[PDB]
Design a protein around this ligand. Structure first.
Ligand SMILES: Cc1cc2nc3c(=O)[nH]c(=O)nc-3n(C[C@H](O)[C@H](O)[C@H](O)COP(=O)(O)OP(=O)(O)OC[C@H]3O[C@@H](n4cnc5c(N)ncnc54)[C@H](O)[C@@H]3O)c2cc1C
Length: 461
């Protein structure tokens, strides 16, 4: 537990790691320390709701070495444990390196004095800081007022602990209910769905919308999505508003505003996240408003020596202005930029951060820009071929983390445009891959189009 560190990375996820790899690649003798309230070393989140549930390895719970869609085993951790130095040797070890203090939470940030306070009473000072604290899962108020009995049977899925505890539960109970129609929630619907078919148990997913991912996707693709979830065996209940939750003889009882009742053994909440601006009080960088997250400049700074990246960061988006994102690609790229800037410097974050989600090897979505379903939307669909699924894409690139394969620079499948007037502000790509460069160039040009079809042809529709 060092008293001082040149580079402090608060929080131990994907942003923090992207930063540290970058710094070491630009200053091969830099001394970087990550503080992580997670017992685990830094690891990626997408598999937690994806491949990890699809493997046939009974040890997959223990090793968290998962198989991608193409068959290649990969670890959920960014680096083997042997690549990090000790927080102890960090201050003096020849060449320095990267160190992670696991199980420790930074609770106080004294910006003026360049110092942090850990939970245990430790005090650490820094020359250069990155806040990469990600977010905290939201619950629903209709859960929180039910007491400690219901709360103890409500997974808020986010971490390895949640994967492990929920995987266990899928082998012990008869009925699991997912609240939330969002991507995570639907990924979790399919994944638990697949385990429940093997066991003969029940999976229920509910949400207020008309269909899955209803805030993002138009009715057609949303309703289709819902039918896909139902094909996995899931009892999907749309237009479900939660009235209250309570104990009813060993079972959880969900009462809806539309009157319906649902008996289930366990709940998994997947209703989004709230940024972690905690240290935003004692620090006096104290966040934005419209969008949530710490305010940063073009180079991702909240102060002259304190950058922010990843989920915690409210950045200026090249085409969309102020924005907050929950994308892994954002994490990696803004994390990488932030680390480059900490090693001096002077580089704007002009990146258009792609989002992607897979519901199994066979269905994949990819978003870029403002993708809200309330906008004017134009969809152009087609019959998908042999290479038009995540399994093929993962076979083509060798990686199942889409952001690595689809590059950073500029009815089975289809493309949905989102419009303010006739300007493309957002795009969804349904089962179409290798076309994010064109997808970016289209939004970045901010052009006006009175067709939509000719554009669609570049996606190979
Ligand atoms: C289950 C799941 C599946 C996902 N799938 C996808 C996907 O398919 N595609 C996609 O684009 N995105 C996906 N995402 C979102 C994506 O993973 C996030 O954008 C990414 O994790 C952001 O990284 P981060 O560094 O901002 O936050 P995190 O990875 O959460 O890292 C923050 C870490 O810092 C810790 N921390 C917070 N505060 C403190 C403190 N004061 N002191 C010490 N530590 C602290 C937290 O415990 C956490 O471990 C998924 C997310 C989840 C949760």
């Amino acid at each position: 537990a060092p008293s001082h560190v040149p580079f402090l990375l608060i929080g131990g996820g994907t942003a923090a790691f992207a930063a540290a790899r970058s710094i070491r690649a630009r200053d091969p003798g830099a001394r970087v320390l990550i503080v992580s309230e997670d017992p685990e070393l830094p690891y990626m989140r997408p598999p937690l709701s994806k491949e990890l549930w699809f493997s046939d390895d009974p040890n997959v719970t223990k090793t968290l070495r998962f198989k991608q869609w193409n068959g290649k085993e990969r670890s959920i951790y960014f680096q083997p444990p042997s690549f990090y130095v000790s927080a102890q040797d960090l201050p003096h070890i020849e060449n320095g390196g990267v160190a992670v203090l696991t199980g420790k939470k930074v609770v106080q940030l004294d910006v003026r004095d360049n110092m942090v306070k850990l939970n245990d009473g430790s005090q650490i000072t820094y020359e250069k800081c990155l806040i990469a604290t990600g977010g905290t899962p939201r619950s629903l108020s209709a859960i929180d007022r039910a007491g400690a009995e219901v709360k103890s049977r409500t997974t808020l899925f986010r971490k390895i602990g949640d994967f492990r505890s929920l995987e266990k539960i899928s082998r012990e109970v008869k009925s699991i209910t997912i609240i939330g129609g969002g991507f995570l929630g639907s990924e979790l619907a399919c994944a638990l769905g697949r385990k429940a078919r093997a066991l003969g148990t029940e999976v229920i997913q509910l949400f207020p919308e008309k269909g899955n991912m209803g805030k993002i996707l138009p009715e057609y693709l949303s309703n289709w999505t819902m039918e896909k979830v139902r094909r996995e065996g899931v009892k999907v209940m749309p237009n479900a508003i939660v009235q209250s939750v309570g104990v009813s003889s060993g079972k959880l009882l969900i009462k809806l505003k539309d009157g319906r009742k649902v008996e289930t053994d366990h709940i998994v909440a997947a209703v989004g996240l709230e940024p972690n601006v905690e240290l935003a009080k004692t620090g006096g960088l104290e966040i934005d408003s419209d969008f949530g997250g710490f305010r940063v400049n073009a180079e991702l700074q909240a102060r002259s020596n304190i950058w922010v990246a990843g989920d915690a960061a409210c950045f200026y988006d090249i085409k969309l202005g102020r924005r907050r994102v929950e994308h892994h690609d954002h994490a990696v790229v803004s994390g990488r930029l932030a680390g480059e800037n900490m090693t001096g410097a002077a580089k704007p974050y002009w990146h258009q951060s792609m989002f992607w989600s897979d519901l199994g090897p066979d269905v994949g979505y990819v978003a870029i820009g403002l993708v809200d379903s309330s906008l004017p939307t134009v969809g152009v669909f087609a019959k998908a071929t042999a290479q038009d699924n995540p399994k093929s894409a993962t076979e083509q690139s060798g990686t199942g983390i889409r952001s690595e394969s689809e590059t950073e620079s500029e009815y089975g499948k289809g493309v949905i445009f989102y419009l303010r007037d006739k300007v493309v502000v957002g795009i969804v790509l349904w089962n179409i891959f290798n076309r994010m460069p064109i997808a970016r160039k289209i939004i970045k040009d901010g052009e006006q189009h009175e067709d939509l079809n000719e554009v669609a042809k570049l996606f190979n529709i």
